[PDB]
Amino acid sequence: LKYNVGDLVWSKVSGYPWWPCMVSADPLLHSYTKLKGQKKSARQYHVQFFGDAPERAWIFEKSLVAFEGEGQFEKLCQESAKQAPTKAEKIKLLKPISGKLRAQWEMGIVQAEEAASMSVEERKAKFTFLYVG
Numbered sequence: 001l002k003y004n005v006g007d008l009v010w011s012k013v014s015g016y017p018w019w020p021c022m023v024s025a026d027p028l029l030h031s032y033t034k035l036k037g038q039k040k041s042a043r044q045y046h047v048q049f050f051g052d053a054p055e056r057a058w059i060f061e062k063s064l065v066a067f068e069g070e071g072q073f074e075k076l077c078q079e080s081a082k083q084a085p086t087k088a089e090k091i092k093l094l095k096p097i098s099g100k101l102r103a104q105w106e107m108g109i110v111q112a113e114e115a116a117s118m119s120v121e122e123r124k125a126k127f128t129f130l131y132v133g
């Protein structure tokens with residue numbers, strides 16, 4: 001497996017910029033990786049999106065990149081724009097992101113860069129979400 005709980009990754013979701021994340025256990029499934037439809041081609045990882053408006057998701061491994069730092073972001077943007085197969089898909093990819101989401105992303109980057117400087121256990125202790133059902 002490429003990742004484990006506490007590993008830092010960028011996640012790409014349609015409609016959002018590459019976003020800093022931490023691999024975590026799903027609080028119901030008690031799993032951090034699975035194969036969608038039990039297809040060997042469809043491995044997903046469970047991730048927390050860093051920032052002040054917490055979200056989690058199951059994300060395909062094909063849409064994860066190991067997180068080093070904010071310095072990666074420009075290349076990630078450039079490669080996604082070059083890979084957009086059509087003019088129409090590229091226009092969708094490049095739509096502006098709100099100021100409110102930009103500030104969430106920027107706070108996410110601060111958390112992820114702090115997380116990177118920490119041990120796996122330290123970052124899990126600090127950043128793991130609380131769930132209430």
Ligand SMILES: O=C1COc2cc(C(=O)N(Cc3ccc(C(=O)Nc4ccncn4)cc3)C3CC3)ccc2N1
Binds near residue numbers: 054058101104105
């Ligand atoms: O500060 C922050 C941090 O997190 C954010 C995430 C998002 C967002 O809607 N996303 C896109 C996104 C896509 C899908 C899901 C998703 O399946 N949620 C699930 C799956 C299973 N059970 C329950 N929910 C969730 C999110 C993430 C950023 C790509 C927007 C703003 C922020 N601001």
